[PDB]
Design a protein around this ligand. Structure first.
Ligand code: BZH
Lengths: 214, 216
């Protein structure tokens, strides 16, 4: 069961350092190269660097003077470190496992979910969550005034998936983000069933459950 | 330093039609060992990149036959026969013959389906929000096609400007529709100063503009 999972700090101030850990599972890093790839908001995929099975590395032209990738085979972990962070460096960072080939991989097999890194001198703010009150009913949650991205939103602890729309965040004149998640439900179940949105904001460690009522 | 040039940037395609994506490399990507290490990746909305094609034309396991890569030297092509709703996202080529490896710019596949009118809902500020000094009026346009849609706010019939924000979802992977939210933000004072709040919506699938409203 191959798994890769990135672990970052979420927010980093300009000029300071970034450390992300990829924890790997269902394979041995003695046998597999891993790539690091990144994606600035709204922009294309950028190759960042690689650490070969043997432990040697290669880096991106643009970032290589500030970049270093290392690993712990015994611990199933790969580390990206990066100095002197600029606004530019705001991105989602993925690790990806090497698939196939002898000394050049045929492709990138399996990817982590990514970890989001904002380079900013603002401080961390948890969201306020306000209900959006309701043969089809729409209800929702307004998730407001948090920094930085991301927030994760689910309904009824992940049980209710169908007809959910969580909208992309918007950045307000205040420098804080704001989104809404909404769900379409049967009108008749409004009397019988309860609906809670589960809002999780990892950078501030704030978990909020909100009952949305008629 | 190898550059990968992907065109077009955006590729609108009807369901069931063919889609052709082009990757050109500034030099040959035939490795000294005779292999040419060119991959194609799909990144769907809210998902990590997934491998489709490796070494120019080999399908990755679990990738359907509608997907085929071809080309050699500098000119390469990804072809998707009978485009399905699930094929929606951004395709990237990848070159791995030369250090440093690079992705192309990306090509966004939008799906062309039949017109679908939005369902409109309006939400008043929550009592919890008012009881802290800010009013957010939310207007939701659910499951529509095409993406172009006009949402206007009227406060006691005063057409509002500068005081609202829009957010549109990515295209839905099951039915190639968009949803949109427009949020009108007022201080509690300025909100409790007015009676009728109206979201007015214009769209190709509607026969005339639909209005959702409420009295505070
Ligand atoms: N997913 C991938 N990560 C990488 C990293 C590096 C790749 N290619 C090379 O390093 C080319 C080396 C060519 C040579 O043998 O000199 C290829 C590659 N693919």
């Amino acid at each position: 069961d191959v798994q890769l999972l990135e672990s970052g700090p979420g927010l980093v101030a300009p000029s300071q350092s970034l450390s992300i850990t990829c924890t790997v599972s269902g394979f041995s890093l003695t046998n597999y190269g891993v790539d690091w790839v990144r994606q600035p908001p709204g922009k294309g995929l950028e190759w960042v660097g690689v650490i070969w099975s043997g432990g040697s590395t290669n880096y991106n032209s643009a970032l290589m003077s500030r970049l270093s990738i290392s690993k712990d085979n015994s611990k199933s972990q790969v580390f990206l470190k990066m100095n002197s962070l600029q606004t530019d460096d705001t991105a989602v960072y993925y690790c990806a496992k090497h698939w196939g080939g002898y000394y050049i991989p045929y492709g990138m097999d399996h990817w982590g979910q990514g970890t989001t890194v904002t380079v900013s001198s603002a401080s961390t703010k948890g969201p306020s969550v306000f209900p959006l009150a309701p043969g089809t009913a729409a209800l929702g949650c307004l998730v407001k005034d948090y920094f930085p991205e991301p927030v994760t939103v689910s309904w009824n602890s992940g049980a209710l998936t169908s007809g959910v729309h969580t909208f992309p965040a918007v950045l307000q004149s205040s420098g804080l983000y704001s989104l809404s998640s909404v769900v379409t439900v049967p009108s008749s179940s409004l009397g019988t069933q309860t609906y809670i949105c589960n809002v999780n904001h990892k950078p501030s460690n704030t978990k909020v459950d909100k009952k949305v009522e008629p | 330093e190898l550059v990968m040039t992907q065109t077009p940037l955006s590729l609108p395609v009807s369901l069931g039609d063919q889609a052709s994506i082009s990757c050109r490399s500034s030099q040959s990507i035939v490795h000294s060992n005779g292999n040419t290490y060119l991959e194609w990746y799909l990144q769907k909305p809210g998902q990590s990149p997934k491998l489709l094609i490796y070494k120019v034309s080999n399908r990755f396991s679990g990738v359907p036959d509608r997907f085929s890569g071809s080309g050699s030297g500098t000119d390469f092509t990804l072809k998707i026969n009978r485009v399905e709703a699930e094929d929606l996202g951004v395709y990237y080529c990848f070159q791995g013959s030369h250090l440093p490896p690079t992705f192309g710019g990306g090509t966004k596949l939008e799906i062309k389906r039949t017109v679908a009118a939005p369902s409109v809902f309006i939400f008043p500020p929550s009592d919890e929000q008012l009881k802290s000094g800010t009013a957010s009026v939310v207007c939701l346009l659910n499951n529509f096609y095409p993406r172009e849609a006009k949402v206007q706010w009227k406060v006691d019939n005063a057409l509002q400007s500068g005081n609202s924000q829009e957010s549109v979802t990515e295209q839905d992977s099951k039915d190639s529709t968009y949803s949109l939210s427009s949020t009108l933000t007022l201080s509690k004072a300025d909100y409790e100063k007015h009676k009728v709040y109206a979201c007015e919506v214009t769209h190709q699938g509607l026969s005339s503009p639909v209005t959702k409203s409420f009295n505070r």
